[PDB]
Amino acid sequence: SELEKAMVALIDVFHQYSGREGDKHKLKKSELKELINNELSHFLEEIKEQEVVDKVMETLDNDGDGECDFQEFMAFVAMVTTACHEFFEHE
Amino acid sequence: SELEKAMVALIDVFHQYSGREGDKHKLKKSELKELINNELSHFLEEIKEQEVVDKVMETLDNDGDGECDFQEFMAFVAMVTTACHEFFEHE
Question: Quick one: which residues bind Ca(2+) 1 (chains A, B)?
């Protein structure tokens, strides 16, 4: 159930937010901002993501005029956590 | 920690598999097959995914000659669960 609880969480947390129907039945990336603020991994401001989060906030706001998909939900939270190569900094 | 445990699981389960270093430090999609067989949501063979899983097995095998990224880890598990539009079948 390790990955099971992972996939469910990504979708169910999206369900919780107030754009699940009203927006595009999905949310603009500007709303994803507030989401990653908390439910990413609490904070994370001290490792490396501190750079990427800021760069994300730029791209998030600019690009996400259309919508943010669950594919990008993963993208943003994974890229702030990585953004270098891949698993080089973690495995 | 709802989404926190989600992101950690996606990466750490990948870490567990025997291609985390030996393959491309990532795994061919062919290995992702075995991964989704179990750690997707146990099984799921009766809702709608039963179609997509097969279509996935085709594409997975054909396209994943290079590698499978964590981005695609999400992609495949999310698409088998969806593949229609977006959250239409779930929210």
Answer: 18, 21, 23, 26, 31
